[PDB]
């Protein structure tokens, strides 16, 4: 909550997402990505994370 509140103010402190290590396309990753896609505003994320 604190990080998201900060990222909505500074115009340059957009959130950077750290993905799980050495596991690709695990079943939980897909659903978590979907939740992020349709629940987290796009302007609060970095271009790389998007």
């Amino acid at each position: 909550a604190i990080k998201m509140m900060q990222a909505a103010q500074l115009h340059r402190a957009s959130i950077e997402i750290a993905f799980p290590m050495n596991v690709s396309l695990s079943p939980e990753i897909i659903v978590q990505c979907f939740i992020v896609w349709m629940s987290i505003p796009e302007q609060l994320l970095s271009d790389r994370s998007n």
Binding site: I2, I17, P20, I29, Q32, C33, V36, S39, I40
Partner: protein, 101 residues
Amino acid sequence: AVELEQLAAYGLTGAYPRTNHSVDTIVKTVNNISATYSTIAQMLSTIDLDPTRYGTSESIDKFKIAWENVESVLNMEGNDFVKTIMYAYEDNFPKKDFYMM
């Protein structure tokens, strides 16, 4: 920086920041810390610490001692938000630019 699972958990269960204070209280706190910073600077302006007398670290130590002395001389004991902020993150800056700041 956040983890993917933490962000997904935050998004799934609708979560929002919550405050138990009023606007006047926040304004008063900000004004108090600003006034403390201004008074500290005004008091610190009188004494002298030139940069060509000690090393890059002895000068920092002398400045810390002077700040503590001034704080204990004029104002009653408090928290000194700016002082603690400076103290905590002093290892994230090189010594020269920290002294300049």
